[PDB]
Amino acid sequence: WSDALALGWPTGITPEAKLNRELWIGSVIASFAVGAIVWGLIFWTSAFHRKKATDTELPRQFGYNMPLELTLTVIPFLIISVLFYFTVVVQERMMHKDPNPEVVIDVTAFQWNWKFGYQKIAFADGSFDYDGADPERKEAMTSRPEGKDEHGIEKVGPIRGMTPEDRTYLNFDKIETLGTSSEIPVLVLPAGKRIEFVLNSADVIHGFWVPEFLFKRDVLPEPKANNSDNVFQVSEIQQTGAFVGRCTEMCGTFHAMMNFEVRVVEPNDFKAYIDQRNAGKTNAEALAAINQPPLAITTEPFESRRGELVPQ
């Protein structure tokens, strides 16, 4: 009954998703109760037809029932206040911001595909002395001594001394699981661990959704400069396997082609995968080595052809 009444909510795979789904079930229960009573009122007053027995006498013509107005304007306030308290306590576990993440994934989301960096891994049980790449971050400070003019301008840069095309906010890593248009990216994560996602976008605002996480976040170009908390954590992921992930914003033409996968494997499988990726190997090769299908099983790559009726 829970699945049917959840209105197509995928049963969460992380405690945050489970709790959010429970809140959704409660909210839908309350909303359906309110809807049932109001629809009952409507279909009941629809029984107050203009009966032919009604002689030349109009109805009571009352209007203006102050006590009833007060009752029906105080009860909704209490209902929404309870909903708001539950919403606040649930939202509290939206990003606990644990200062000790077990694996940090640098999620760059560029124009019409994804890239996952594996910025840092530090298992609480004790393992994975791994880190990201501090180099490769090259600024674009246009601090030339002189511009077109002869002297005096000594222009530093448009914004904070930097040109708009800077990409210093973008952080890079040694292990990059870039997604090609013909090879859907598969971010592999260890099951049972705390996984932090540091979200960034290369070109345009867009979204990052894992329907099984019951949570999405907008990958912004420069979240820190935009006053956005791009980074967000997931306490755990119990269920293993591959879970589709969509882009949940507007990106451009190929916005529906940004589907990726999150493949939750066992911690030992993640050990083997990261070791074999540190060794020169692609994501598909590492998946095959750890004996898991290399290509995204939940979603095939979209046909790069612009449509069915195009003549190939």
Partner: protein, 103 residues
């Protein structure tokens, strides 16, 4: 958009043609059908409902209609252009709207 979404494949629409459709469908329905028709009903009966003979500035409300009509048309005019209408959705978020994106 609905005919295209009936089947999983891209039967007859391209990605950007579809993107233009919900952009203009969203804006046309809101800004060229919903927001200009409240003043359509207001101009219809509001002077009647308050007992007035006409609106305060009856040449101005005439200008308002024509600004609506011609303003609406030049937004629809994106279609006749080879590129098409606006790709970005009705919301028209910032980075996707700048000259770099959707030029």
């Amino acid at each position: 958009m609905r005919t295209e979404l009936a089947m999983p494949g891209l039967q007859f629409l391209s990605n950007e043609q579809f993107n233009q459709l919900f952009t203009m469908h969203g804006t046309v329905m809101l800004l060229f059908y919903a927001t200009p028709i409240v003043f359509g009903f207001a101009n219809l009966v509001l002077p009647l409902q308050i007992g007035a003979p006409d609106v305060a500035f009856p040449r101005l409300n005439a200008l308002s209609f024509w600004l609506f009509l011609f303003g609406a048309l030049i937004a629809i005019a994106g279609f006749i252009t080879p590129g098409g209408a606006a790709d970005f959705g009705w919301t028209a978020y910032s980075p996707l709207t700048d000259a770099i994106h959707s030029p």
